[PDB]
């Protein structure tokens, strides 16, 4: 109530979105609210690539507040690349506004076929400054300095398909979202929302694993080596060439992720990473887990995790809070 709330809706279960506007005239865009990146871009009316033909385009010539920058920038994500140029204008998230430096994307070719397929216009990073390009302070941070929000923190209470919507809450922790104690974990760097936990999936163990709480990832990421072992006798096939794992939804050998710290124990039961796919086969399910290797063992605690656990991203305390989410408001 005394905080900024953005509503979250989840359609297909690939990636949920949020709305926000750029420009003094409230030009509307659909954003992926990404804690894994630190920039905010929108497809420009200068965009020449095909992905833009069906997206909401920003037209700087229609906003009084627009302010030209022009320096070229490129964005590289795990899933793709987009390019354009910086610009400056009034960004509005929820019921708060502020002048901000964003990217007008004119080239999407390096983000296909995902971009055209998906139904979002751009991305809105919610990470740390160091991670950004063009030394841009996080929105939530700026909002705080400007005395526009109580605290420099934001929370995620993810939506669940065809059940209840979600919320991005800026500046305050609302207890309405969870139950039980909220256990804070320290970051090991002010780059990613990355903390250290022990990963004990079944009989496989990774002590002091690098963990990234990330709203921009639809799956649970795991080091390929670890995924292979982890599933070694649980009656789970890996598609011959296709990077998926199909299994029976009822498969009693499905494991439960268990990450532990001094302050908490977080578990992710099958019910949180199983994707029914009757179409393919009656009783079949695909695991929402995927391999992704970093130079140091790392897991990406994606949406499946944040969908069970309410999370607090606290800049002032350089830590991430975790609480069991209320199944319904």
């Amino acid at each position: 109530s005394s905080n900024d709330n953005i509503e979250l809706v989840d359609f297909q279960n690939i990636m949920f979105y949020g709305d926000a506007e750029v420009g003094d005239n409230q030009q509307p865009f659909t954003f992926i609210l990404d804690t894994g990146s630190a920039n905010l871009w929108v497809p420009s009316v200068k965009c020449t690539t095909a992905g833009c033909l069906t997206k909401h385009l920003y037209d700087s010539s229609k906003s009084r507040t627009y302010e030209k920058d022009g320096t070229k920038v490129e964005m590289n994500y795990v899933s793709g690349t987009v390019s354009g140029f910086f610009s400056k204008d009034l960004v509005t998230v929820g019921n708060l506004s502020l002048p901000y430096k964003f990217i007008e994307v004119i080239d999407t070719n390096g983000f296909e076929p995902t971009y055209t397929a998906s139904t979002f216009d751009g991305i809105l990073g919610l990470g740390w400054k160091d991670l950004s390009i063009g030394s841009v302070d996080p929105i939530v941070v700026e909002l705080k300095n400007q005395n526009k929000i109580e605290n420099a923190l934001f929370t995620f209470y993810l939506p669940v398909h065809d059940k209840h919507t979600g919320f991005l809450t800026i500046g305050g922790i609302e207890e309405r979202f969870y139950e039980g104690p909220l256990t804070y974990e320290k970051l090991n760097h002010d780059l990613y929302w990355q903390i250290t936990l022990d990963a004990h999936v079944g009989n496989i163990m990774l002590e002091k694993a690098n963990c990234i709480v990330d709203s921009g990832t639809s799956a649970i990421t795991v080091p390929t080596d670890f995924l292979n072992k982890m599933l070694q006798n649980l009656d789970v096939i890996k598609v011959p060439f296709l990077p998926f794992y199909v299994t029976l939804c009822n498969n009693s050998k499905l494991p439960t992720f268990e990450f532990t710290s001094e302050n908490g124990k977080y578990t992710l039961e099958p019910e949180y990473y199983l994707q029914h796919i009757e179409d393919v086969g009656p009783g079949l399910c695909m695991l929402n887990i995927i391999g992704l290797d970093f130079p140091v063992p790392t897991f990406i605690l994606g949406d499946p995790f944040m969908r069970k656990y309410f999370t607090v991203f606290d800049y002032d305390n350089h830590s991430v809070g975790i609480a069991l989410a209320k199944k319904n408001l």
Partner: peptide, 8 residues
Amino acid sequence: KPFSXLQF
């Protein structure tokens, strides 16, 4: 590619 908008 695994759907992840983490940047490097």
